Each structure stands twice: as structure tokens, then as C-alpha cells.
Amino acid sequence: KRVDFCGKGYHLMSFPQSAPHGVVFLHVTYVPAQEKNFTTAPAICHDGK
Amino acid sequence: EAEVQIDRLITGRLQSLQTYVTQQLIRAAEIRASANLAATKMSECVLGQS
Ligand SMILES: *[C@@H]1O[C@H](CO)[C@@H](O[C@@H]2O[C@H](CO)[C@@H](O)[C@H](O)[C@H]2NC(C)=O)[C@H](O)[C@H]1NC(C)=O
Known part of the structure; x- marks a missing residue:
């Protein structure tokens, strides 16, 4: 859950690969797309509640 | 004679x-380690909730 620790976006999973004197991580993340506009409210009022 | 005296200055x-x-x-x-910690705090405290 650490932001940016395992790639950009919401981390899903990672896979390691070996390199000559190092390691390559393949990070799979979720990136939200195609946002729409809406009107919001904090609470609803119904029956005086 | 000035070579011997110039070398003493060069060495020092x-x-x-x-x-x-x-x-x-x-x-x-x-x-470098302080800046690496600052970069992690910018990611985890400013662009998120830790
Ligand atoms: C949600 O609505 C806002 C405001 O209506 C949109 O903001 C527009 O942004 C563009 C930038 O290219 C401005 O030129 C417009 O003046 C803004 N207002 C408009 C178009 O009414 C925003 O784009 C909307 N978001 C989505 C995802 O559609």
C-alpha cells in the first residue's frame, strides 16, 4: 500500500527477473481511466434523518 | 636546489x-540518504495517507 514503492498506480503484483549484476522488477498496477463528472452530497436527508 | 624545495610543497x-x-x-x-528519505516521504505522506 506504500504509494510509489512498487510502480506508479495501485500495486497489484510484481515479478522478478535476474540481470547481470542486478535485478529487474516487473510491476503490474491498476490505473483508472475515462472519468466522468457528477454532483455530490455529503449526506441524504429522509424523514428528518 | 629549487626542485628539492618545490617537491616538498607539491607533496603537501x-x-x-x-x-x-x-x-x-x-x-x-x-x-544522498537524506534526499532518498525525503523522496519517500514526498511519495508516502504528500501523495498518500500513510
Ligand atoms: C467537468 O466539468 C468541468 C466544468 O464544466 C470541465 O472543465 C472544462 O475544462 C476545459 C479545459 O479544456 C475548459 O476549457 C472548460 O471551460 C471547462 N468547463 C466546461 C467544459 O464546462 C471538465 O472538463 C469536466 N470533466 C470531464 C471529465 O468531463
């Missing part, structure tokens, strides 16, 4: 310059 000044350059490497390795 080289020693002093190289001491300066070692202590800067050791001080930069410490500034």
Missing part, C-alpha cells in the same frame, strides 16, 4: 587536496 598540497576530496565523498554519501 597534493595531500591536502586529496583529503578534501575524500571527506566530500563521505559527506555526499550522507546527503
